[model samples]
Target: LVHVASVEKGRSYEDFQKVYNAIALKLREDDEYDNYIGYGPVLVRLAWHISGTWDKHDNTGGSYGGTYRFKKEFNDPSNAGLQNGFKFLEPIHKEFPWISSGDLFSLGGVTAVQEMQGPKIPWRCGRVDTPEDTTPDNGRLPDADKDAGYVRTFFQRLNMNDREVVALMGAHALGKTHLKNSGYEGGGANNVFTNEFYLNLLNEDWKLEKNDANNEQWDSKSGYMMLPTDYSLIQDPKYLSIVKEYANDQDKFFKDFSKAFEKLLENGITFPKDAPSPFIFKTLEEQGL
Candidate 1:
């Protein structure tokens, strides 16, 4: 068997603690964003895109290499507009050039999620850079045009279970789908933070409309955007109930999202059972350091 050796490396819990301080301080400095929701969602999305590239059999891609800075990785059409996340991170990347792009990107997601009141994701370091040819092909990520079955099936390839899938999608509660990027348009608007995606999924009697900019996606009347697949979560009775549950309780959403996101970032890598529990890094706003 070809070995897919581990590539985990970075700061110990203490250094990551310092990195946390740097990111939290920078958050206070950023004034430009989706109506100034700050850089949270895009950062999470960046982590997702990087980790989303893993394949179980080959174990070739993932947040391990922190490789998204390369042209081959960034130009990925599926990555579409993730440059916003990268742009947001540019200063942070500058302030901490020693961190790997793969590491920085994934850690950004971890920080965004936890700071947003999600879970404590245990992370490790050792993701060295690989050559460009090693980059996974585009489309490894899910297609928004897809249906729920497609969504479920696609995630299966990534090794996510149903609950994990639901929680990650809940992240849609944070950011938005851009017309230019994902053939979908705005949803989370104005001081827009909510566990409302679940409520929208269950309560809204949605009708699909073609966005002004995209040919394939369908926008909703309730001022939310649903990919054919996101809608599928409710259409498929199994997913609908959990959607309703998250809508009813933000705390429930937060708990589930944290666990699922930690799982998502880990992707295909197997850690020993005796392995350490996830480190809970305090946000700059919270660290007081």
Candidate 2:
């Protein structure tokens, strides 16, 4: 089961940049979505969920295959609330039909992160769509009710190390979890990307409480929340160290997150020796748009 990098026919950096610009522009224009949190967070989550399905041992599921469009993956219980992101991308896909589903999905995350003033994630253009049967089954994404051990073990299948896992979890800073969507609810939701997830983990005085969904989450008096898995970072000493580092140094967090995220998205694919270097797309602000 080998998936080689295949750039879309006759498409290059500029074409993909246009696609990115569309996503970024919509992210700004659609300011009313998610109660004004906009489409940025959901778009990032959609990319993560789509790529998170990969199992390194067999390589059956991954961003290499744009199978999230298939029913099985789309209806995945773990994917609840991501329909917003899919709907957001529908217009972009219609406009530039050449971009593969995987490419578009992953690129949405890159665009969302940059537009939200995160880091530059060097992205490659490839990821041809696999067939419907190729869609990974449900339950591949992690559960929120779990602990640090569970978090570490589950990510092992995805080949993420402790630092990578912690860095990636920094994404939690972006959006709040909906109880209806993930059986968890409420966090200090912000559209901008930052090291605040780590800071909150270390700084907040959290109380374990049950939400309306009857699931336990760590809640702060300041009106923030943390899933059991998120709180587990501080609970585990090793994870705590990295969490502290990220909390103290924003630049390091940005750099590590960029590397880990790019690695996460590129898993389960083989790039040819002559494959083009990854493209770092400029943000709308950077382009003075």
Candidate 3:
């Protein structure tokens, strides 16, 4: 079941880099959100949510199809906060109409991460949009209320191993939740990408309590909130081991995170062996951002 990625006609690395710059530039200019937290976090969230629907069993939901544009997926309860990211990307899409929705959405995450000083993530183009009928039903995303077991089993459907799951969760270093947006609350720092989330999880004195929404969450006065699923990373010995490793070694966390995230985004899409190796784009910093 090899799926060959369809490269856009007449498109190459330079073309994608232009789109990445557009996203990066807007991310820098749009500084009003979250009191200056910017769109980096939400773009990362958008990428994850858009790609999180993959089901390895039958390969139904995944970022490859770009079905999130459909009303049904757009309105999913799990996607409540993602509209911000989508709206932020609207101008980019308008400016570069050739790019598919999934590519823009996923690439937004990659661009956001690199611009924020996260690791280099190799990306590819050619995700064609599919019809609305291809969108997976709601509830494919993980529930914040769940435990480590639930998180593990949930990711299993995506064919991810423990290391991959733990590595991907490192993304929590990027965003917070509004009680009104979701039952969960705060996380991450103002826009810089680092393993601070993992460090905070390990070092913070978290108290288990219910937020205004009456949903259980781990909170600290430092203005950080952890979902039960996040707390589970330290509770479960297997996951806790990796959590400790990531906490102690920032570079390790970044490297592991890069691979796991790439895998997560590419899941359910069978790539032909001849598919080009992933493209690693330079950050704005690298190009005198």
Candidate 4:
């Protein structure tokens, strides 16, 4: 029997918002990491990877438990290069120790997205950390070097349909893959938040090649890259259709991507329907940053 995580005693939106500011402020102040792209991209990836472990059937490894804090889940090869995100959150965690790990991790992504000018992602709270024994075994996350069929099937375990899967993947727009991180390389914009990833996919003339990392990746003269998984978007007729749809329509992509991202983060967790409609946070722009 598992006990659901509740919002901490005497906590509310104001408290979480402060945590959000801390993350955003540090994102600007720490503008030195990864050739000045800041922590925004990796933070988004961290939040997604942490929440991505969810299994819709059993509800075992979602962000609800914060199990990624445990060593086993933290060191999963799929999690390589996320340690930077954890380190970035350390001081914020120290200051606002009341927030659960799961909430902080998920909220970090929200902050990064808004700071980078992405769509407004409505967020919720109430994820309690679980015991290490509760950690799901590794290998639940998707493999990058896969084809469209594998991408579709992998997301099915999380109850995501084709449209939702494509929408969620639009997030690759925010970050680049490091050779050390995932044996892949290059990405769009890397810092700005837009439908640029879709635009690149639709425009770039990509050729399949094995990179120096001894992995198959799509390379282009523009120096952008698409993993086999990303390339799979254009290869599959169904996914390709959505890719073109998103490419021509950034607003539609933003709306659909926001909805799908929230769903991806919230997967496997039972939230009370009355529990709070999601939160649309104020961005750095609103605060005049």
RMSD for each of the candidates: 2.7, 0.7, 1.4, 1.4
Give the Cα error of residue 119 in candidate 1, in Å.
3.8
Full-model lDDT, candidate 4: 0.86
- Regarding lDDT, does 1 or 2 come out ahead? 2
Q: lDDT tens digits, residues 1-289, model 4?
A: 4446477778877887788889999999999898888999999989988988887777778788888899999999999999999999999999999999999999999899889988899998888888899888889998987889999999888889988988888888776788888888776547988887788888989998987789988878887878889889988999999999999899999899888888888887776655766667787779786
Work out candidate 1's RMSD over C-alphas. Answer: 2.7
**Model 2 CA deviation exceeding 4 Å by range:** none
How accurate locally is residue 214 in candidate 1, as Cα lDDT from 0 to 100?
45
- Candidate 1 lDDT tens digits, 215-246: 55445665776777788888787788788788
User: TM-scores, in order shown?
Assistant: 0.88, 0.99, 0.96, 0.96
lDDT of each: 0.72, 0.92, 0.86, 0.86
Top model number, TM-score? 2
Model 1: colliding residue pairs: 7-126, 7-127, 8-125, 8-126, 9-125, 9-126, 66-102, 122-278
* Global fold similarity of model 2 (TM-score): 0.99
Error of 3 at 237 (Å): 0.8
Q: Candidate 4, TM-score vs. the true structure?
A: 0.96
| Tens digits of lDDT, candidate 2, 1-289 | 9999988998888999999999999999999987889999999999999999999999889898899899999999999999999999999999999999999999999999999999999999889998888888898998888889999999999999999999999999988988788888787779989899998888989999988978888999998888899999998999999999999999999999999999999999999888889999999998999
Tens digits of per-residue lDDT, candidate 3, 176-210, equal: 78877787767655688888877888899999988
Model 3, residue pairs in steric clash:
3-270
Superposition-based RMSD of candidate 4 using all C-alpha atoms, in angstroms:
1.4
